[PDB]
Amino acid sequence: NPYARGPNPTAASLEASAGPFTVRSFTVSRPSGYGAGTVYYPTNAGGTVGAIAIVPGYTARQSSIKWWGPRLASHGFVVITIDTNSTLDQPSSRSSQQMAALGQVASLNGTSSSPIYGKVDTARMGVMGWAMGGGGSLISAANNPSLKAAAPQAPWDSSTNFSSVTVPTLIFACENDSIAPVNSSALPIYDSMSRNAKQFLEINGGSHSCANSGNSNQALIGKKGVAWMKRFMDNDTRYSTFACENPNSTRVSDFRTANCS
Template structure:
């Protein structure tokens, strides 16, 4: 496949949504660290320095190994949510960091695809939670519904998580995101369109009859698969990405030698860039910018990557 030219605006000078609290402080801290290194003072490593500048920052400084690992720094607990105890979606499983010493965490709800169940995306639960998120993998009211319904159910799951769940005290309700596979990926776009306050959206080999998403103002990373014959990238993932505003923090990662169902199994590339995207935009954690900018290059697992760098101020 021929690589597509990168045409995104290289710099975004201001945050039009005004929801990136803590970023300016993070940039100032970064500048101070750079100055310290320049004058030979060494890195600024005083305990809690980063956390003081960005109160949403969680966990140790990331490395390539840490974001590719099967488990991150947090031990994870889980709790089942019965469909009989909720309204608007089909129940599911909540994965969350066991420790409460770091305060509250950002959260993400994840929907399966058409005809699929929560089990098809369950691997993402502990993997993302162990990096410092509360993760809600859900079942839907029916396996045969459409993306708009999946979007509403993702939002209903987030509402349950933050308002009624047994772990609601562990969640920062102002820092939420959505993910989904296939029909659920199309649903994650619907959810972001309906609720602009969401901080991140990650559609995985998404399917949707609606091809244009200029209304979305949530930072969005779309995964496509070069061998997808169910939601071919040419008629789904690529036009979805291209229709997002060029001023939006957006990314398109096309998986190499992958199929529509690649997101249904543990996958290091999906996990690595999902963690980086969620950290960068739910937690405003600029320590993860290094994995997104410069743009990832084609590799054995990446057919191509398009996006904007640096990300919004």
């Protein structure tokens, strides 16, 4: 596997606050079609890595999703967290902005003054995001089936039919979400997807912000997000158990998975 990076994973190494690589970050000078961005990248991955773009929910900014930047980048990914053009953008616009941010990561990979010059394998990309940004990630996956992985959290879209999605998709859900209730949002979205590796991980007692920065389940949520991205962005079957397993955890009120290997 030419995409495999880093030491062999263990539960401990995936639950830790940081992975094996050192992370640095920068602010995007001229965002291409979105509001603002921060790029997180490993300084010592030892080969090119995939890129992941992460979008917040309605009203929200990078702070809500920023913890993913160092968590993922320290396991060997370039991660861009964005602010949208308006905090009040809807899922479709969020998806366009998310893909523009991936395009700009690809640009920076080819820009000799960038810290990520030659760090990115632009053929291997993923999408994440919270709430309307989670709906935007599912729209991105539907429209761009060559994306390698999606892992939205507490997603919402005014449509729940994502039978279009063929990209491996992990849905984080929050049991007690009152803003995008699981039974009308995350779960029907999950159930709609028929052609992909997929997983549903609902956090016991979680509010709508249960997978955001500052959450109290970073060990489990970070292990699953990293494992999913490693398995599917890097084709890295060292992560197949971590990606596919039911954690059998008292922190999880609902687990489902299909077509996972």
